[PDB]
Amino acid sequence: KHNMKAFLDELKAENIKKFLYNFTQIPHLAGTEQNFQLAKQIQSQWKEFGLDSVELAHYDVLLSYPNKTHPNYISIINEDGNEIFNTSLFEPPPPGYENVSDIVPPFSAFSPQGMPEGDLVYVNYARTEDFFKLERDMKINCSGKIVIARYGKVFRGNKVKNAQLAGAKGVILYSDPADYFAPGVKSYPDGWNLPGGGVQRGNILNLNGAGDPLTPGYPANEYAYRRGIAEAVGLPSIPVHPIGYYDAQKLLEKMGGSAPPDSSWRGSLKVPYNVGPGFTGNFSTQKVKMHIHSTNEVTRIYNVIGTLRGAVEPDRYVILGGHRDSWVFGGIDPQSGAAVVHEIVRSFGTLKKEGWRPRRTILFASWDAEEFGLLGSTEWAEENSRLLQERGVAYINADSSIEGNYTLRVDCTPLMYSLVHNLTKELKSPDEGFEGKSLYESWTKKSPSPEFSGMPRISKLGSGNDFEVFFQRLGIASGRARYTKNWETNKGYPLYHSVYETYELVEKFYDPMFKYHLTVAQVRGGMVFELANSIVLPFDCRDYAVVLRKYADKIYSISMKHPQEMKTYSVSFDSLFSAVKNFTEIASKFSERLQDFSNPIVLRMMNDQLMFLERAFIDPLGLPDRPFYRHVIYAPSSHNKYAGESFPGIYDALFDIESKVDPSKAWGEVKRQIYVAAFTVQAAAETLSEVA
Amino acid sequence: KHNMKAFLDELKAENIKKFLYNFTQIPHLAGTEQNFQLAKQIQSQWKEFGLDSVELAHYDVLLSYPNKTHPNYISIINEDGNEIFNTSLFEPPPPGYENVSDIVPPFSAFSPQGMPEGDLVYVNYARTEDFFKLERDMKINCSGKIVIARYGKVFRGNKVKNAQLAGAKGVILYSDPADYFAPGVKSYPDGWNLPGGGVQRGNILNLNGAGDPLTPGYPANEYAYRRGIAEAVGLPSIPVHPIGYYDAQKLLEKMGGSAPPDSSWRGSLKVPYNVGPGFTGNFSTQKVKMHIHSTNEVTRIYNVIGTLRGAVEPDRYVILGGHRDSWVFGGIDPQSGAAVVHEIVRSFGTLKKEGWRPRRTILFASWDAEEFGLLGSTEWAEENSRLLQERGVAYINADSSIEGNYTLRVDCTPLMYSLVHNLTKELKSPDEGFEGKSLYESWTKKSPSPEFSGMPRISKLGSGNDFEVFFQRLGIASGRARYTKNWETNKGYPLYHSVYETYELVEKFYDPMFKYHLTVAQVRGGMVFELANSIVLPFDCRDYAVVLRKYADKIYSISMKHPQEMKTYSVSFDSLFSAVKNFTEIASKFSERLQDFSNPIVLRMMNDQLMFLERAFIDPLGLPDRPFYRHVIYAPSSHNKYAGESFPGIYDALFDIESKVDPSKAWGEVKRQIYVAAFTVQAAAETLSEVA
Ligand SMILES: *[C@@H]1O[C@H](CO)[C@@H](O[C@@H]2O[C@H](CO)[C@@H](O[C@@H]3O[C@H](CO)[C@@H](O)[C@H](O[C@H]4O[C@H](CO)[C@@H](O)[C@H](O)[C@@H]4O)[C@@H]3O)[C@H](O)[C@H]2NC(C)=O)[C@H](O)[C@H]1NC(C)=O
Ligand SMILES: *[C@@H]1O[C@H](CO)[C@@H](O[C@@H]2O[C@H](CO)[C@@H](O[C@@H]3O[C@H](CO)[C@@H](O)[C@H](O[C@H]4O[C@H](CO)[C@@H](O)[C@H](O)[C@@H]4O)[C@@H]3O)[C@H](O)[C@H]2NC(C)=O)[C@H](O)[C@H]1NC(C)=O
Numbered sequence A, B: 001k002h003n004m005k006a007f008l009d010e011l012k013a014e015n016i017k018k019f020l021y022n023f024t025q026i027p028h029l030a031g032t033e034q035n036f037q038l039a040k041q042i043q044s045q046w047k048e049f050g051l052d053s054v055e056l057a058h059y060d061v062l063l064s065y066p067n068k069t070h071p072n073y074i075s076i077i078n079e080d081g082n083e084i085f086n087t088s089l090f091e092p093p094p095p096g097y098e099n100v101s102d103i104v105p106p107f108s109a110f111s112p113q114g115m116p117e118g119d120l121v122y123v124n125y126a127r128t129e130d131f132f133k134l135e136r137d138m139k140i141n142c143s144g145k146i147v148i149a150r151y152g153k154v155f156r157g158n159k160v161k162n163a164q165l166a167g168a169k170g171v172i173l174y175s176d177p178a179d180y181f182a183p184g185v186k187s188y189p190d191g192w193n194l195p196g197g198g199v200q201r202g203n204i205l206n207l208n209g210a211g212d213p214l215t216p217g218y219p220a221n222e223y224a225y226r227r228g229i230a231e232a233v234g235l236p237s238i239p240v241h242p243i244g245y246y247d248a249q250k251l252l253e254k255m256g257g258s259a260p261p262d263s264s265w266r267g268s269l270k271v272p273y274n275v276g277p278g279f280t281g282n283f284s285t286q287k288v289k290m291h292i293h294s295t296n297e298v299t300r301i302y303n304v305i306g307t308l309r310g311a312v313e314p315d316r317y318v319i320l321g322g323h324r325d326s327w328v329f330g331g332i333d334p335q336s337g338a339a340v341v342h343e344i345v346r347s348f349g350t351l352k353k354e355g356w357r358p359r360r361t362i363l364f365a366s367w368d369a370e371e372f373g374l375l376g377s378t379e380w381a382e383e384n385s386r387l388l389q390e391r392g393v394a395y396i397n398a399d400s401s402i403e404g405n406y407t408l409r410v411d412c413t414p415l416m417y418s419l420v421h422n423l424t425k426e427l428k429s430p431d432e433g434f435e436g437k438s439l440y441e442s443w444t445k446k447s448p449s450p451e452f453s454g455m456p457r458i459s460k461l462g463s464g465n466d467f468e469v470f471f472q473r474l475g476i477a478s479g480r481a482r483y484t485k486n487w488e489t490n491k492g493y494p495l496y497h498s499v500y501e502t503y504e505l506v507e508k509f510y511d512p513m514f515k516y517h518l519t520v521a522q523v524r525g526g527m528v529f530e531l532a533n534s535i536v537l538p539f540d541c542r543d544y545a546v547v548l549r550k551y552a553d554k555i556y557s558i559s560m561k562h563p564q565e566m567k568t569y570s571v572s573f574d575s576l577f578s579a580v581k582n583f584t585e586i587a588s589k590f591s592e593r594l595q596d597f598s599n600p601i602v603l604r605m606m607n608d609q610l611m612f613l614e615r616a617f618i619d620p621l622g623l624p625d626r627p628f629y630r631h632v633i634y635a636p637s638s639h640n641k642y643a644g645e646s647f648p649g650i651y652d653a654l655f656d657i658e659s660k661v662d663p664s665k666a667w668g669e670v671k672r673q674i675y676v677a678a679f680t681v682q683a684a685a686e687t688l689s690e691v692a
């Protein structure tokens, strides 16, 4: 039989291992010749595997690279202008890679050029609340200072936006051992910890879903009209550069001025973590100097797009996509994901070669330039937005398969909760001590839902990965899954975006048997299989009704911290609760009808209602000043692109509202957002009513 | 048999006559009790006629009314402040209506209040080119002057926008006999001409598709958050008032200053048509004073929505909609249209009562507050936009059935050209001298296409009617048809929006036999019938390919008036011509496939490609500063809401480009628009490619 079990059984840990090794021997930086060659290889193999068509879709997008003959670095300069200490020019390469060419040195992608000199201020994680604490509570002024912040907690682009709005003239990012060195584990190569010379690369854009900075709204094709640099979307206006903690210590050890406000501001280095500004007594005349010479350049990128045509509904697309470009070797990020996609394609192809086809079309994507701002997936979705809008059933992301070896992590639309629960009950747990138990069982035990007994935690989608265009711009039901760490015992993974994130890191320390990779392949592949093959789309609209109520209760509780203003400005959540109640009632009736109907037009009608339900949460006017975040229930946090926020329109209207100069205007905008949310929930509910 | 012929044969001229009489005995002004009562009557009758459901959909929208106890008027005031001449307070009512209550006096809906006093400048039709001529060529400054303009040529809202941007402090609109008095025909009641005391009412908003000024994007429901007046969309900032030509003569006869630039500026009154500013010698100290006291008020409106559920595809909607509100009696506008819709519903219902259902759902709409800015259709489409976007097959408008008795007029998407041709060849001509000939024959003979031998003229859709939200905002294939005048022998209809536009006007002068009404009922009803019942949607994508080429040639010829700048700024139309060539090739292949396939999923796939093809021309970012005009091929002219413009993005970028201060920036924006148009045409073409 050709059923999901046949598909799942064909997936092999040994194949994922071989593919991962294959994908991680050399760097695959976006826009480079090596990454184009890997694109061509993936295309060729996907064709051999049996896909109906496999094409490259190329775009010319703004990328960023260091200048090879004018290296980036930071100095402490004495009163005379002598540079008395310099940060590293590169990470010491790991054993056996000391002769590998084309390792890009650590840098912050899209930093402007400059050589600012100044006094340091230490801003903790550079979060919104860290700047509140500095400016409002400590009365420390960041204007014209060079800010030093530790990586962690939030997306690095938000840190740089926050620093820039505080008036900083430069940003130094570093990895503190408190955040990137797990106690009792050794540094790479002897363990999975970040060494002192290790450095996290990464872009520092604030794109808000725009894709290529130069062509928001439209694909960056051959005849595209491009914004000039000064009108580009999301570029930082001050120089930024990342360093490791050996170098950070040399910069922090001399800091004077004010003490850290509390222990939450202290990392693990043997330094005071003084906020500054500037150095203590002796060194008060020394300054910090940045030297940034990176350039932005329009460069060609290549997505690989594979099609497996549906037998019955070829005009319905289930998409499995993840990126292929990496900062260096991409041992985890993204090749642990791409190797899994590769094995999934291979498995679907084996079934295809025996005469099977899925009911719906499956599209497989190897995205380029994800690391530079989700550029490849976004440009391709901008090009194909009409096909995706009208035919897109679901998008399953497939970046890093592991960030730990403890339990499953799933973030997805509520429309997929029931699918994920059912699938994981049919899969074997790979965990020690759960031999013969289901993945659902081990996952639920290790990661209990905070509100429901005997269910596992599933999180809302945030952003900072390639599902962003599909979910928050286009409103296509999206999901992701990976193996993760135990959050209780250790508060991503230490070697992220460093030269040390290699094949050996994975094979030795994370997943020697490749069983977690195999489990992730089964979850991601199984979800695709069911989405593409189940006669009735496997979405349960009632799960959306339940979370909408949770989110409404939550946003109302935020507003209720201001009872006087709610009285004064007549702020009522009644319409939103009413819309949510209506959604609950209508969804329940629709579920009954879905149970109670071989009439293929009736079937296609109801599948279209399921498919367009995610779509109904899209507001074509977008969220305030973020036109590409159109989903009214979920957006990336305005303070942290990685985290999802619910009812983001209302949330942002309420945020720090007690500081607004014009409360009448500010509360008017809260009310406007409540109306938009209530209306959108009611409109989505009505897509599930009888159609006539 | 229950076929189109059964439907068409059931339509009766006598019924349309009876309905028109019924709908025109009293005024039905939007927001008034009489118009709510008529809404309830239509609802009750549509239910009796056999529709499955008939509901009222109500909204609370900004309307505008004169103050009953503080009448609007215009004066000439002498040096002392004595008002020596006053314009009329009302139109002399026609015979037998001299005791009818609640005739709203002439006014310009949404004028602000004010009493500006000043010197007159005569600005012809107040078109963009009329102001160019005044300011650039004659060096006449409109700043702080009261502008007087004749109605005609363009939508009155554009006149007021133009006057306002020229610095006018008030606008007087009048009906010149040159435009509203056909030679050799008598004034009402003895003929169909405008008397000297006759006055055209009408709104002077510049909404650009927004709907209710206070709630753009969202329906004006019970909990809607409303803009304050100062942020409302589209409201004029200077007082405006309309007058008839007896009153206009008293205002024009004294004008001094400069002579009219040429004969195209002279109407038919026995006055010089001097441009001003101000009066000649003797009267140079007299001024014109307006007294406007109208108020804007949020008022409830009611659409009637009737459903006839489809037997096979109930989740596909063909919409027949037209408005019900009128300025006064609405003898032509809109009741000649609403009476036809009424008879069409009655006919479809007779077939339904014998056990027939259309294949697809038909929705029937009686829209309210059309005269105040398309408010009822737009608010209902904003409320239901997700259902319309995903399920809307087509929208057929049904306002005034006649504006003349000469031949047919059709404006529609190219997707309906073939449908209209085929249908009119099956209908009998009602014209004298074409007894026994088809409507196609008489129409083609009287209104030949300017580029194709033996075809009739069909125009592109403009705006200024209720299809605007469906076509230019949502991208639903739309069409309209009516009987019209001979444009050659006479350069709308004279009694438009006047108290004299009555049942007797129609019955005596336009259509005593109601045969033109019956022909229009057959065209509009037949189109609905075919759209709702044909197994394959009756759209021919190849007709779009042909007009796209015409429009591309046209826009390229506009740009080619500036060959030097095209060389300098490297402006190429190559991408647009390439996209159009691709659309032509892909559409031709799709048509072959459509010929060459009882597999109902294959059928539904290809009908979805037909249905979503209009949708593919929508750009979700909208046109520059007009977010609700989203169709990239067609928008209402920025200079005349009634007229459609093709490739409006490029057209507006090229318009008057030789006057822009920064040619580099201006030509950059032309290039940007060419890229958007090329991309959108190519994207639409690709929706017709094989889906996988
Ligand atoms: C959730 O679903 C329910 C349907 O089960 C839906 O209920 C609707 O609520 C609206 C808005 O509150 C009701 O609107 C009323 O309609 C009647 C006519 O049917 C009017 O007469 C009412 O207006 C008068 O009263 C108002 C309230 O004080 C006054 O402000 C106004 O000036 C008038 O005097 C009013 O418009 C509507 O009838 C129901 N529909 C039903 C019960 O079928 C509800 O709105 C949905 N929730 C959301 C957020 O959409
Ligand atoms: C209409 O349909 C046709 C398909 O029949 C489609 O043709 C495409 O045109 C594009 C854009 O011109 C071609 O793009 C090229 O692709 C190759 C790879 O296949 C590249 O090597 C080319 O890039 C090089 O050359 C460029 C041109 O000088 C340089 O600027 C560039 O730097 C590179 O050196 C180039 O990107 C594409 O291959 C075809 N596709 C085909 C023939 O299948 C056309 O674009 C459609 N029209 C519109 C408006 O979409």
Ligand SMILES: O=C(O)CC[C@H](NP(=O)(O)OC[C@H](NC(=O)CC[C@H](NC(=O)c1ccc(F)cc1)C(=O)O)C(=O)O)C(=O)O
Pocket: A151, A152, A153, A154, A155, A202, A203, A333, A334, A370, A371, A372, A373, A374, A399, A400, A462, A463, A464, A465, A492, A493, A496, A640, A641, A642, A643, A644
């Ligand atoms: O440009 C973008 O939007 C993102 C590009 C790029 N995405 P990518 O590196 O492939 O993946 C980001 C992300 N992975 C991570 O490890 C993020 C970094 C890690 N932080 C987290 O995992 C994190 C996650 C959620 C959260 F709410 C707060 C923090 C850290 O800061 O060290 C993911 O797996 O989705 C990046 O984050 O630089």
Ligand SMILES: O=C(O)CC[C@H](NP(=O)(O)OC[C@H](NC(=O)CC[C@H](NC(=O)c1ccc(F)cc1)C(=O)O)C(=O)O)C(=O)O
Pocket: B151, B152, B153, B154, B155, B202, B203, B333, B334, B370, B371, B372, B373, B374, B399, B400, B462, B463, B464, B465, B492, B493, B496, B640, B641, B642, B643, B644
């Ligand atoms: O607010 C709006 O957008 C329009 C509200 C309202 N629409 P409505 O009066 O029912 O119909 C407008 C229009 N009818 C007309 O007669 C328009 C007026 C007539 N002009 C035209 O017919 C005209 C038509 C096309 C054109 F390119 C230039 C002029 C005139 O100026 O006397 C139509 O039948 O679609 C109005 O125009 O006041």
Ligand SMILES: *[C@@H]1O[C@H](CO)[C@@H](O[C@@H]2O[C@H](CO)[C@@H](O)[C@H](O)[C@H]2NC(C)=O)[C@H](O)[C@H]1NC(C)=O
Pocket: A021, A022, A025, A040, A041, A044, A045
């Ligand atoms: C990764 O695997 C691929 C495919 O096995 C290797 O590329 C092939 O190398 C073979 C034999 O050495 C050539 O004959 C083919 O032309 C290549 N096939 C392709 C591109 O599809 C590739 O060398 C491997 N890379 C590494 C670093 O191990």
Ligand SMILES: *[C@@H]1O[C@H](CO)[C@@H](O[C@@H]2O[C@H](CO)[C@@H](O)[C@H](O)[C@H]2NC(C)=O)[C@H](O)[C@H]1NC(C)=O
Pocket: A075, A081, A082, A083, A084, A085, A086
């Ligand atoms: C840090 O690096 C800088 C730049 O390479 C060093 O300063 C340079 O040294 C050379 C040779 O001594 C001089 O000719 C250049 O003029 C210097 N450049 C600048 C910009 O000052 C510096 O010595 C290094 N510091 C340490 C501690 O290694």
Ligand SMILES: *[C@@H]1O[C@H](CO)[C@@H](O[C@@H]2O[C@H](CO)[C@@H](O)[C@H](O)[C@H]2NC(C)=O)[C@H](O)[C@H]1NC(C)=O
Pocket: A418, A419, A422, A538, A539, A540, A595
């Ligand atoms: C997940 O599995 C549950 C349990 O089988 C499914 O719920 C059942 O669906 C069947 C088939 O329609 C019904 O007859 C049962 O009454 C359902 N049982 C319940 C609700 O306890 C559920 O449909 C699956 N979810 C999917 C496939 O998304």
Ligand SMILES: *[C@@H]1O[C@H](CO)[C@@H](O[C@@H]2O[C@H](CO)[C@@H](O)[C@H](O)[C@H]2NC(C)=O)[C@H](O)[C@H]1NC(C)=O
Pocket: B021, B022, B025, B040, B041, B044, B045
């Ligand atoms: C227009 O026609 C309608 C329907 O025939 C008339 O309204 C009805 O009047 C009858 C008998 O006079 C009443 O008993 C009904 O209650 C009404 N029916 C409705 C509202 O559906 C209406 O009077 C006519 N109006 C004019 C001006 O002729």
Ligand SMILES: *[C@@H]1O[C@H](CO)[C@@H](O[C@@H]2O[C@H](CO)[C@@H](O)[C@H](O)[C@H]2NC(C)=O)[C@H](O)[C@H]1NC(C)=O
Pocket: B075, B081, B082, B083, B084, B085, B086
């Ligand atoms: C035009 O109308 C105005 C206003 O009704 C007339 O002027 C008013 O006349 C009354 C009685 O003579 C005075 O008490 C008011 O003070 C006047 N009002 C204003 C605003 O001036 C005027 O006479 C009329 N002109 C003509 C020619 O009929």
Ligand SMILES: *[C@@H]1O[C@H](CO)[C@@H](O[C@@H]2O[C@H](CO)[C@@H](O)[C@H](O)[C@H]2NC(C)=O)[C@H](O)[C@H]1NC(C)=O
Pocket: B418, B419, B422, B538, B539, B540, B595
């Ligand atoms: C309008 O009528 C023409 C002539 O009948 C239709 O074109 C024919 O369609 C049939 C049925 O598929 C084909 O077999 C013929 O070859 C077509 N004749 C032609 C192109 O000359 C056309 O389809 C109709 N248009 C509609 C229904 O929108």
Ligand SMILES: *[C@@H]1O[C@H](CO)[C@@H](O)[C@H](O)[C@H]1NC(C)=O
Pocket: A067, A068, A069, A070, A295
């Ligand atoms: C890199 O720096 C060198 C050496 O100082 C310089 O000549 C060159 O312009 C730079 N390359 C760039 C900016 O691409």
Ligand SMILES: *[C@@H]1O[C@H](CO)[C@@H](O)[C@H](O)[C@H]1NC(C)=O
Pocket: A141, A142, A143, A144
């Ligand atoms: C910080 O200091 C600078 C002086 O260089 C001044 O311009 C700015 O207003 C100060 N900002 C705050 C928030 O105190």
Ligand SMILES: *[C@@H]1O[C@H](CO)[C@@H](O)[C@H](O)[C@H]1NC(C)=O
Pocket: A192, A404, A405, A485, A509, A510
């Ligand atoms: C793998 O699992 C073991 C057992 O819990 C743990 O001690 C080790 O830290 C894990 N490895 C990684 C990289 O998390």
Ligand SMILES: *[C@@H]1O[C@H](CO)[C@@H](O)[C@H](O)[C@H]1NC(C)=O
Pocket: B067, B068, B069, B070, B295
């Ligand atoms: C109408 O004018 C009267 C009489 O002068 C005035 O009292 C009233 O306020 C006005 N009504 C309005 C503005 O609605």
Ligand SMILES: *[C@@H]1O[C@H](CO)[C@@H](O)[C@H](O)[C@H]1NC(C)=O
Pocket: B141, B142, B143, B144
């Ligand atoms: C017209 O006249 C006014 C003086 O009241 C002046 O402010 C304005 O600049 C003039 N405009 C033009 C275009 O000449």
Ligand SMILES: *[C@@H]1O[C@H](CO)[C@@H](O)[C@H](O)[C@H]1NC(C)=O
Pocket: B192, B404, B405, B485, B509, B510
């Ligand atoms: C009706 O048709 C006749 C014959 O051409 C024409 O003379 C008359 O003007 C028409 N009536 C109207 C209102 O156009």
Ligand SMILES: [Ca+2]
Pocket: A210, A211, A212, A214, A215, A216, A217, A218, A219, A220, A379, A382
């Ligand atoms: Ca883009």
Ligand SMILES: [Ca+2]
Pocket: B210, B211, B212, B214, B215, B216, B217, B218, B219, B220, B379, B382
């Ligand atoms: Ca609205």
